[PDB]
Design a binder for this molecule. Structure first.
Ligand SMILES: [Ca+2]
Ligand SMILES: [Ca+2]
Ligand SMILES: [Ca+2]
Ligand SMILES: [Ca+2]
Ligand SMILES: [Mg+2]
Ligand SMILES: [Mg+2]
Ligand SMILES: [Mg+2]
Ligand SMILES: [Mg+2]
Ligand code: NI
Ligand code: NI
Lengths: 346, 346, 344, 344
């Protein structure tokens, strides 16, 4: 039936939607959430994960770990909040923050308070899960992959028993935050480079190639409303506000009429991979490039050019598109979860 | 009326079409052609330029220089012909080769034979043209830019009086020969880096962004036939064979139903720039990247994000698309030239 | 008495450094962490425990087994199927058989050494850093991967750590590569990270110094005079360890008498008055293809034009021992070897 | 008598090298090409002509003005508005006024020096390379941009060129940067290109040698004995040129007596028997951020394990002068200065 997994993320509006999908999906049995640094600090992403869980009535059920604050060998790009903005904008979190229950991780760790949380806390829990897995243990990663790189440096022999499903990278289209690279890779390219060389079974399930086709149209919004408004009009509003928080930026900067939704597509891959195309290849992560670090460079074209002249072994699976009906299936899954959450919030 | 210019290229089927357009266009007054290394040796590209000129009855009129054999600081990617293939495939050049007239460059240089041709031969001629130009002298470049980099190393003070119009690079779409870079840049990225820092007025007139939309459809072929068949059915056949020589590769490797035509678009920019969109930006050429050398990385997105936070000065113009009617205008120009050539061949 | 931790990859030199630090009454060793080197971190772990048991301290000092490879580069460790111990020239069979339980296991609540994990030392170091009045002292004489890993997990502790290292070369060339020293080039990103972190960092024992700390026949005779009357067996093994690479140093590097490296770093913590010190900005080469691990400083620019300095100082460098420093070092080492001889 | 060309950036050292090569009967200098350095290539052009006119040879030897900057990097030349000549310590006013026409102009069919272009020397070098029975000899004592540019234009000539250079440092550290020497680091891509091209390349005068070629009080007295009886004015200027950087070498680099570099390369072409030679593979660092221009060899790997060598030899390196080599060098230099004194 259900698949045990861990979520590693940097919420983040997209990651919030991914957490909702993974936690409320009966197909996924979330063991824990670990947070990482991003354009916000790891302490902020920690809080944002807990906010997400408390909004959906699960903050007392799922342990959240606060991971590493910066990349392996590069500087963080995290910005301070300027003057007491929430850091997960579009919503007032004041109530969610004050009603926040105790993090279950504290009891697992034998800690009294959150000030004792350390980046490597999740390690022993992941090792237990990896050890107990019959084949491989599933991690969904939708932020920087520093946490997993750090884990593999401490537990190198676990690489062969880990399967990663990620939102990361761009292959046949260009990048977002930099010309040819995607945020999650370029923020710590050494980490993903390390992971690909470690023996991890790695799938780029949700590169920009796919997520730029997963768009929040007026049609989607109406489907959200039909599923959520009868149970929780308040939740309806928050979801829409979160989904549309960057609508203007995506339009004005990137030419999107309707904004994309990224990270939940990775969880959807673990739920229902049959909706995705897959190809195997060797991915090199650019680390030396001055302007191109985090580029995901593949030998896919060389395979089509001259199959026999391939030298480098395949080290990854890449999903370049959803199959017909895949977009509909994704939105159906997401709307189902939002509806269930709406029923629980009331 | 007409604009004096020089062509620097690596023919190449695309470059052949560019030479035809520039030479037969009354708007462009071609002073010389210099050839460069590419996926064929500079001696082969030299021959291919002369073949082009002799096919169109101009080999006695235009001096051709044989330029540099390899990049500034990298290895050539030139391949040998395997067993006496022409090197400009789709056509038997045996007659064109044997009827080849003397290269006018030899008399300019005071040389007796082609074995005396040296890479720096074109320098003095270009310097005369640059010196005599009222404003700037126009160069059309559709291969590696090694020759122009070499020129500027010898004549640094001429940079400010040169305007380059190129087929090179990719900006908002991915690369061809490598994941994120285009052949002409990645073959000698140091050369283009040098040029952009030199003071040259540089326009990326025909990046893949445009040329991947300039497609040889059945409609185009029929228009070619209507213009050429009444005067020279033999020429009609050769043009089509040259245009379609890589049709299968473009289809099977790159998914093109109809194949692109690249290099002549750069000459069309010099003829009629009003059909092109233009934007100014700072282009960094990746030289350190292991897998991403030759990437054209711009601050275009940073301009749209935060105009006031721009630091690096603009160093290039980029043409990201043709305006409405631009494709039609391009094909009309090309077909007009092919028709005139057809009349001359008979 | 100064509380400290040792991080090392024994290693013949590191063995001598452990002996000095542990037997010196000036240093109170809280733990030893081991790192990857020419051999695996599991071998260096064993070699540290061998050292402690030889000197009758293996029941007193916890040993942690640290990280197996660099942050972002491959290990240079031989594969175990080469069968190289990393403490050659001596039969360890008795030392291995008589080995007592590692005190680390009880601290960690582990039953056996198979449970040791790279990050085990973290909580112990954090306790020591927290309790330090000023800064806590670490002696590092191998790759610095362990400390980089620690600082990635505890970035706010950087400002309360002082590192004293054997690493680098400044005014002379390198050993394993033309212009760089083994401990840096094995993980240059780690040292780069440490220098940027806020750690108070001293290059106490670069090759500049250690290549002048030579095991002469005079030194050997002084060792014998101190050790032979109490333990002739120990005398033999110390000399065999000191001279294990004598031929290579001679034939490859032109040394008539071989150097002794790592203990010089511990000697700096014991008696810094014997060392020259200069502050500067050290850049660690990480991009270079053939020069990664090079320690590049602005020392010449300081002497050229003091006011035109741009980069802030991030390190202290010891370029030479002062007059009498060599004598003082050997006196210290011989004293410790003598005390071990009396015990062991 | 060996036909050769000089490529240089005078420069006080290069001035001495020109004097040696031109006045030595063993070397038949065909031309001098100048390159960019600490000053512009136009200044080094002038400085070469100054040198020739001082020694009464400016009407005999053509001088070419080469490339103004490195292949792919920025020049490190001061801007001309600093007003630094690059041959400081001497008034050149008379030498400038009496300067005869450059013979290069007639070879090139130019009317004046304003027509000189960087690639002017190419056709002359190609004639000499073509006519050489074996290989044609180039002495290079500045950036090697000119020769790299030549080989890009004439790749098939590489196999008929022999280069003898002052460049690099191998078993000691660098000068202008921690681990690299000026002539390499100013254009490392150029030397990288040359080593890959098929040129027969000798590092005849790395810092390893030139830092042992010192202008002692003994040398100065020998200079005086040879020159003062014929031209006391020349004596003064030679000494002033030799000692122009004496204070900097002392205060920055610890030299009691300053080195003399570039003429050692010409001395190698005259009398190679005074030099040790070893063949190896030299990699020039181009990627390094702080270490570009480092000359990294496989010399240690050869001594470690001769059979495990992978990369083919691409260079000869001279790491030291043989016994009597220093004496022979100074004897040669003093002889030339004496002959100049008699003429000038
Ligand atoms: Ca995310
Ligand atoms: Ca072309
Ligand atoms: Ca060690
Ligand atoms: Ca010089
Ligand atoms: Mg679930
Ligand atoms: Mg025309
Ligand atoms: Mg002690
Ligand atoms: Mg001579
Ligand atoms: Ni081995
Ligand atoms: Ni100046």
């Amino acid at each position: 039936m259900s698949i045990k997994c861990a979520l590693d993320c940097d919420p983040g509006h997209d990651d919030l939607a991914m957490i909702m999908l993974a936690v409320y999906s009966p197909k996924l049995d979330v063991q824990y959430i670990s947070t990482t640094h991003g354009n916000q600090t790891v302490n902020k992403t920690y809080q944002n994960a807990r906010r997400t869980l408390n909004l959906i009535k699960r903050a007392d059920k799922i342990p959240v770990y606060r991971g590493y604050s910066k990349p392996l060998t590069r500087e963080s790009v995290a910005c301070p909040e300027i003057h007491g903005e929430s850091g997960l904008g579009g919503v007032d979190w004041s109530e969610i923050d004050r009603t926040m229950p105790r993090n279950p991780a504290l009891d697992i760790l034998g800690y009294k308070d959150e000030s004792e949380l350390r980046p490597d806390d999740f390690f022993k829990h992941l090792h237990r899960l990896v050890s107990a897995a019959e084949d491989k243990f599933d991690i969904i990663s939708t932020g920087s992959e520093t946490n997993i790189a750090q884990y593999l440096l401490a537990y190198p022999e676990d690489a062969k028993k880990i399967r990663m499903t990620t939102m990361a990278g761009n292959f046949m289209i260009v990048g977002n935050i930099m010309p040819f690279a995607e945020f999650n890779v370029l923020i710590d390219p050494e980490a993903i480079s390390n992971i690909l060389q470690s023996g991890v079974d790695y799938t780029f399930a949700a590169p920009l190639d796919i997520t730029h086709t997963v768009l929040v149209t007026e049609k989607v919004i109406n489907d959200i409303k039909a599923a959520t408004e009868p149970y929780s009009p308040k939740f309806t509003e928050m979801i829409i506000k979160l989904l549309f928080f960057f609508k203007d930026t995506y339009r004005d900067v990137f030419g999107f009429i309707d904004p994309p939704l990224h990270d939940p597509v990775a969880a959807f891959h673990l739920i229902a991979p049959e909706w995705f195309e897959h190809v195997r290849c060797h991915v090199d992560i650019e680390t030396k490039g001055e302007y191109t670090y985090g580029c995901c460079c593949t030998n896919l074209i060389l395979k089509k050019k001259d199959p026999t002249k391939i030298v480098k072994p395949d080290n990854a699976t890449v999903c370049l598109k959803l199959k017909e009906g895949g977009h509909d299936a994704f939105w159906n899954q997401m709307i189902t979860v939002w509806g269930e959450i709406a029923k629980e919030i009331g």
